[PDB]
Structures are given as structure tokens and as C-alpha cells.
Amino acid sequence: RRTGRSALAVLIRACRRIQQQLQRTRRALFQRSNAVLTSLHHVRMLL
Amino acid sequence: LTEACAAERVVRPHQLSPAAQTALLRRFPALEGPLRHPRPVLQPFDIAAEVAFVARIQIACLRALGHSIR
16 A cells, blocks of 8 residues: 555645646736836826 | 826826825825925926926026016
8 A cells, every 4th residue: 555555645746736836826927017017007107 | 106096097196086195195195295285396297397397497587588678
């Protein structure tokens, strides 16, 4: 049991931590471009 | 002052909403100058506000010249 299942605890955690960063790459990449959305509208706000 | 005028799409913050004015004034208190002064000698919220400060003096002397020559 410690060879068959223990070849799988290697490969259950492997997929379940690739999928968790993909929640955090949605959030840490547009809150840098929302400041770009602030400044690009701010160029006409100068005008 | 950008995002309160960018999310509200207020192109010039003298067209800012009266609650949207004072809520920013409740946040940052040094903005009573460029929002609540009757005739500030420096123009509020313009890029050439220092340049338009100069061009008046260029104008106001020429009338002081031009009506004195007459």
C-alpha cells in the first residue's frame, strides 16, 4: 500500500498546486494594469 | 483625484460631483485650495497653471502700457 498509493500522493499534490497559482495570476496582473487604466484615462483628464 | 475622476469619468475636477468633492476632502485635506477658493492667483487643475500665471502679467502690463500711451 505504501508503494502504490505512495506513488500517487506524489501525483495528487502535483496537479493540485499548479491549479492554485492560476487563481493568483488572475489577481496580481490586472491590479498593475488598472493603474494603467487609471493613467491612460488620465491623459485625457489632463486635456 | 485621478480615479475619483476616472471612475466617475469627470474630465475636469471642477465638474466633480459635490459629494465626490467633499469625500476626497474627507480623505486628503490639502485639496481645499484647488477646489474651494474664489479666485486663486494660481489656476486650479491645469498643466500650464504656472504658465497662465505668467501670461496674465504679460497681458496686464500691456494694457497698463496701452492705456497710458493714449
